[PDB]
Amino acid sequence: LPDSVDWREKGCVTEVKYQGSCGACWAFSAVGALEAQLKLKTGKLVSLSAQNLVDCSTEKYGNKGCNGGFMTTAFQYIIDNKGIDSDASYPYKAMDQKCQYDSKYRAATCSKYTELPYGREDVLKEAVANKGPVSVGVDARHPSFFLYRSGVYYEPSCTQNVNHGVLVVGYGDLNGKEYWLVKNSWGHNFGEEGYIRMARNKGNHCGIASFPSYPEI
Ligand SMILES: CN1CCN(CCCOc2ccc(-c3cccc(C#N)n3)cc2C(F)(F)F)CC1
């Protein structure tokens, strides 16, 4: 495997999104993973509708819209629904709404998804290198995560109990200190202009390898 990977260099990551006061992190994580697969399959980089997930991947999928949800059950909605709309046709409103999916605005499909084994950062590394960006949950319930500005993030009070959906778009090392490159959905001013580099091979730090998944078109 390569020592470092960055999927932004490969034209597979869209601009950073801003979830606002709506807990749609899981929707943004899910769409981000699919966006990479869509580029790999079709040649087009297109932001997909997180709002479509918030509004439509609801009770039947065990999701709670702006009060949280799962990337895995989001992918299964896209599979069952036979499509997801573009962000352009179904833009983000940071609120729970009635489902407004229309197949006339379909931008991607999903055929399957894969959930990686619990806590295996080596299996995660392999998937990031060979398959694409991987949706993950992290423990983001610490002020240090909010206040993060730069470098490799390490929080000694972090747990493996995950509560925030993000996307691993790469990995590497900062002067030997190994990290995962994570795309957040907290706007362009969070962390390193939307991104956080999180400690890698530090005992599943903040639960980053607790619940990884990726979709396929
Ligand atoms: C330590 N620095 C203070 C000034 N900061 C200036 C840039 C702004 O920093 C932030 C950006 C987003 C968030 C944030 C937190 C939860 C949800 C969402 C959503 N959606 N955005 C928080 C901060 C914040 F907590 F840090 F303010 C950077 C961090």
Each domain of the chain, given as residue ranges in start order, spans 1-217
Return the structure tokens found at 99: 């489902």
CA proximity to 124, closest of 110, 138, 145, 111: 138
Provide the 3-class DSSP secondary structure of residue 195.
strand
Q: Experimental method used, please? A: X-ray
How far is Cα 2 from Cα 45, in angstroms, rounded to an integer? 24
Rounded Cα distance between 140 and 76, Å, is: 25
Residue 31 CA to residue 215 CA, distance in Å, equals 10
Residue 179 pairs in a beta bridge with 172, 199
Which amino acid would we find at residue 123? V
Say which of 12, 22, 25, 206 is annotated catalytic: 25
How far is the centre of ligand 1, averaged over its atoms, from the C-alpha of 147 (Å)? Answer: 6
How far does residue 146's CA lie from ligand 1's centre (Å)?
A: 6
Which protein residue's CA is at the shortest distance from atom 1 of ligand 1?
Answer: 147
The full 3-state SS of 18-76, as one line of letters, equals ECCCCECHHHHHHHHHHHHHHHHHHCCCCCECHHHHHHHCCHHHCCCCCECCCHHHHHH
DSSP helix/strand/coil, 121: helix
Instruction: Yes or no: say if 75 and 217 are a contact pair by the CB < 8 Å rule.
Output: no
Substitution candidate for ligand 1 out of 19, 163, 189 with most atoms within 8 A of CB: 189
Residue 214 tokens read as 């990726």
Strand blocks (E) in the chain? 5-6, 84-85, 106-108, 112-115, 134-138, 152-153, 164-174, 177-183, 195-199, 213-216
Catalytic-labelled residue, pool 66, 164, 204, 205: 164
Q: Which CATH superfamily is domain 1-217 in?
A: Cysteine proteinases (3.90.70.10)
CB contact at 8 A, 32 and 67: no
Phi, psi angles (nearest 5°) of residue 172: 180, -155
